[PDB]
Each structure stands twice: as C-alpha cells, then as structure tokens.
Design a protein around this ligand. Structure first.
Ligand SMILES: CC(=O)N[C@H]1[C@H]([C@H](O)[C@H](O)CO)O[C@@](O[C@H]2[C@@H](O)[C@@H](CO)O[C@@H](O[C@H]3[C@H](O)[C@@H](O)[C@H](O)O[C@@H]3CO)[C@@H]2O)(C(=O)O)C[C@@H]1O
Ligand SMILES: OC[C@H]1O[C@@H](O[C@H]2[C@H](O)[C@@H](O)[C@H](O)O[C@@H]2CO)[C@H](O)[C@@H](O)[C@H]1O
Length: 291
C-alpha cells in the first residue's frame, strides 16, 4: 500500500517511547494505522502492539504484536498475547526495516486479518486471534523513534472532509467520490483547491433544493461566472451516487453514476497546483479515490 489521499485523523507527533495511547476509535474493517519513524543506529528490536487496555499487571492482552528484530538475518516477529502467555509466532523475514533508515508502516485492519505494508511494499498479513473490537490501545516499545502516528476510520469520512492529494493533479488523473445525498439535503459540494494560492480550481456544487448544478472557480479571493447548463439534474435527495471528476488537458469531465454530466474548461491553468480535495454538505460520504 501507499495512501493516495492524506486524511489521517488524530495525528500524533514525536511521541515519547514507550508510548501507550488510546486508539481514539474502534478498529473497524477499512481502518488504517500509519506510523512513521526511524530505527536508531543501536536498535536491537522494537515493537508496535495493538493491545486491549493498558494494564501492566496483569499485562494487558496484546491482540497484535508487530515486532521488528534486527539480527544477522533480520525479521519481523508477530504474535498474540492472551492472559500473559504468548501464542504461536508468525515470523516474516526479508525485513523492510533497517538501522538508521526511516520508514512508513501502514497497518490495515481487515475482517479477518491485519495487512501490513512498509514503505509502499507489502510486508505481511496477520490473522485475528483476538476480536479487533477488543483493541483500544496502541503500544510502542523498544529502540525506535516515532515521528508521527495517524489514523483513518469510518468517521475519517465525516464532514467537513478535507484531504491532500499525494499525486499532483494532471491530465489522466481521476477522482471519484461515492456517497449518498441525505434525505432532506439542500446541497453539498466537492472542491478541488490549490493549497498554496488558496484558490478553488473547481467547485462542484449540486444543489438539491433548487435542482441545479452550480460550477465555478474561486480565484483572487473571488467567485467567477457560474456554469449551470446541464442536460438534466443528476442528483436526488436520499439517492446513492458515484461521481467521476476526470481532469483532462483543456477541462474537467464530470460524470454521475456512469453517465456524463458536464465539462468544465480549466480556469486554474496550473493543474499540478491542485493538491486539495474538500467535500462537505448534505450527504453521507462513503468513499473517495484519487489516482
Ligand atoms: C525483558 C523485558 O523487559 N520484558 C520483555 C519480555 C520478556 O522477555 C518476557 O517474554 C515477558 O513475558 O519479552 C517481550 O518480547 C517478547 C515477545 O516479542 C514475544 C513474541 O512471541 O517473544 C519473546 O521472545 C520469545 C522468542 O521470540 C522465542 O524465540 C522464544 O522461544 O521464546 C521467547 C519468549 O517466549 C519476546 O521476549 C514481551 O513483550 O513479552 C518484550 C518485553 O520488554
Ligand atoms: O459560485 C458558487 C458560489 O455561489 C455562492 O452563492 C451565490 C449563488 O451561486 C449565485 O447564484 C447568487 O447569485 O449569488 C450567491 C452569493 O454569492 C455560494 O455562497 C458559494 O458557497 C458558492 O456555491
């Protein structure tokens, strides 16, 4: 894995090790845990532990033991601790971790397993031995320096929604959003803005109360001329939808549920400067995909 969208919540910076912190939400499937740091020049071993509570006597059960160890070979040791007793070790060699090297660990929770990627490469999978609903604390021990920890939950898609685009906007770039208009929705908006110039390159504003689709750009602290022509208002309150914002060389092509909706001639000509996605309004956000 390698997150295309940066929308981590509850960002933690430079935590002191050992760090024992409460996971601010339940680890439901689709949940991501992102840990960034580096291995000190001495480091013999360190561990990331998803635990059920933080009692240390008796030692809290460790639902998921992620234990990178540095030795001749070099590996990542995984296990589970119930009633202070270790279960069967699952060991992965060809360790992505190395001394004096920085890393990004993405721990993804699946219905039946944890899937782990380190530095954009798949590293290992881990079957749940303890229900994940029982995990509420993150423990980090050993010789490792933590720069930042971040999370992505179900609420991670709560509104207002803001997210950075880890891949510059440019021709061929697609952005899709799936969601559902609320039953009594007035309107909602999806914007592509340029963080730098705090400009709104594309403002897609479906308004359900007036059955119209306002499209415009906000540049130089000002709204331009609106674009509302459309063969037919595609949105209806309470309706599930998927929207495709496709950036092309001269304009944006936007479709809803597999049917073309409109085109929008680029007003912000620095396509690459479009590094932000904002979603807000009267809808239920279900999914967002950059690429
Ligand atoms: C030294 C200390 O302060 N406590 C350690 C503990 C203790 O060594 C003791 O195990 C407490 O019960 O070890 C901790 O790491 C252990 C953990 O990584 C488990 C995971 O399987 O392995 C233990 O070592 C194994 C070893 O991998 C096997 O090859 C061997 O056959 O058995 C050993 C023990 O079963 C690690 O020591 C721990 O959290 O329990 C780290 C503490 O800081
Ligand atoms: O242009 C998008 C921008 O519109 C603002 O509202 C406008 C409205 O679109 C226009 O038809 C009317 O004449 O003037 C309103 C006041 O500017 C929204 O407030 C803003 O959020 C965007 O949606």
């Amino acid at each position: 894995m390698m997150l295309s969208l940066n929308n981590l919540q509850n960002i933690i910076y430079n935590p002191v090790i050992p760090f024992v912190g409460t996971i601010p939400d339940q680890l439901d499937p689709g949940t991501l845990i992102v840990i960034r740091g580096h291995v000190p020049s001495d480091a013999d071993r360190f561990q990331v532990d998803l635990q059920n509570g933080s009692s240390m006597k008796p030692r809290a059960d460790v639902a998921f033991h992620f234990n990178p160890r540095f030795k001749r070979a070099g590996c990542i040791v995984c296990n589970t601790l119930i009633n202070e007793k270790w279960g069967r070790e699952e060991i992965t060699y060809d360790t992505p971790f190395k001394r004096e090297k920085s890393f990004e660990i993405v721990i993804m929770v699946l219905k039946d397993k944890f899937q782990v990627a380190v530095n954009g490469k798949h590293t290992l999978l881990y079957g749940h031995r303890i229900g994940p609903e029982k995990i509420d604390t993150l423990g980090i021990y050993g010789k490792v320096n933590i720069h930042s920890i971040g999370f992505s939950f179900s609420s991670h898609m709560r509104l207002p929604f803001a997210a950075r685009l880890n891949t510059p906007m440019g021709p061929g770039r697609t952005v899709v959003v799936k969601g559902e208009v609320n039953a009594n929705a007035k309107s909602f908006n999806v914007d592509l803005l340029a963080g730098k110039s705090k400009d709104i390159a594309l403002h897609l504003n479906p308004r359900l109360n007036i059955k119209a689709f306002v499209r415009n750009s906000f540049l130089q602290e000002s709204w331009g001329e609106e674009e509302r022509n459309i063969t037919s208002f595609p949105f209806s309150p309470g309706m599930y939808f998927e929207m495709i914002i496709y950036c092309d060389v001269r304009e944006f092509k936007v479709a809803v549920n597999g049917v073309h909706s409109l085109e929008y001639k680029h007003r912000f000509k620095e396509l690459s400067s479009i590094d932000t996605l904002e979603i807000n309004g009267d809808i239920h956000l279900l999914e967002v995909r950059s690429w």
